[PDB]
């Protein structure tokens, strides 16, 4: 790396929707981050403690597919490893088709509306 992840923690005015974040990472030749196992989760947690980005929320590459698949990763891979927060994904008010990371030690995931403005994490 110059499995590689990079945090994008932005000021209030420079956060992005899920689609804007996905396009940003793809313009770099990468994608929104997928977390495929415990090792990858630890790597990202170690990046958060390095930056003081505690408690912050980040887009991951989680996106709802067909009703049959449930959530998938934007980079193509299926969701095998899961770390949803308890009760999630709950599709609250039926409008939550993207996934975010709560960047605290639990490293848990939540489904949320894709037009929410968040920080994000790229993989490359
Ligand atoms: C603040 O959290 C609540 O709203 C978000 C969407 O804003 C939801 O994504 C989230 O699931 C829901 N939590 C519960 C317990 O329903
Ligand atoms: Ca939710």
């Amino acid at each position: 790396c110059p499995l590689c992840f990079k945090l994008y923690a932005k000021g209030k005015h420079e956060k992005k929707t899920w689609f804007e974040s996905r396009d940003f990472c793809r313009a770099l030749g990468g994608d929104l981050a997928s977390i495929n196992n415990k090792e990858e989760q630890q790597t990202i947690w170690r990046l958060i403690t390095a930056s003081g980005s505690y408690h912050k929320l980040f887009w991951l590459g989680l996106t709802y597919g067909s009703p049959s698949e449930g959530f998938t990763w934007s980079d193509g891979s299926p969701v095998s490893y899961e770390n949803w927060a308890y009760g999630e994904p709950n599709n609250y008010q039926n409008v939550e088709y993207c996934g975010e990371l709560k960047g605290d030690p639990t490293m848990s995931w939540n489904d949320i509306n894709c037009e929410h403005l968040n920080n994000w994490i790229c993989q490359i």
Side-chain angles (χ1 to χ4, degrees), residues 86-92 96 100 110-113 116:
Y86 183 51
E88 311 281 359
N90 66 349
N91 195 9
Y92 200 61
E96 304 200 308
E100 65 172 3
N110 174 41
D111 60 334
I112 192 149
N113 178 276
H116 196 242

Side-chain angles (χ1 to χ4, degrees), residues 33-109:
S34 55
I35 297 171
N36 302 275
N37 49 65
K38 281 302 207 322
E39 189 176 20
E40 289 178 8
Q41 175 171 305
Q42 164 75 9
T43 300
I44 292 173
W45 172 242
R46 287 219 46 182
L47 281 176
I48 286 166
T49 78
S51 63
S53 297
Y54 301 107
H55 307 294
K56 295 189 166 177
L57 303 162
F58 299 88
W59 287 128
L60 303 176
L62 291 163
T63 171
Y64 201 80
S66 69
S68 163
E69 319 170 81
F71 276 87
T72 61
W73 297 107
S74 69
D75 67 4
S77 56
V79 177
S80 52
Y81 178 80
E82 283 177 309
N83 201 37
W84 294 106
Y86 183 51
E88 311 281 359
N90 66 349
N91 195 9
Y92 200 61
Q93 308 194 354
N94 268 93
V95 300
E96 304 200 308
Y97 294 114
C98 289
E100 65 172 3
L101 167 75
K102 179 176 297 184
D104 66 17
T106 72
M107 290 290 288
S108 63
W109 309 343

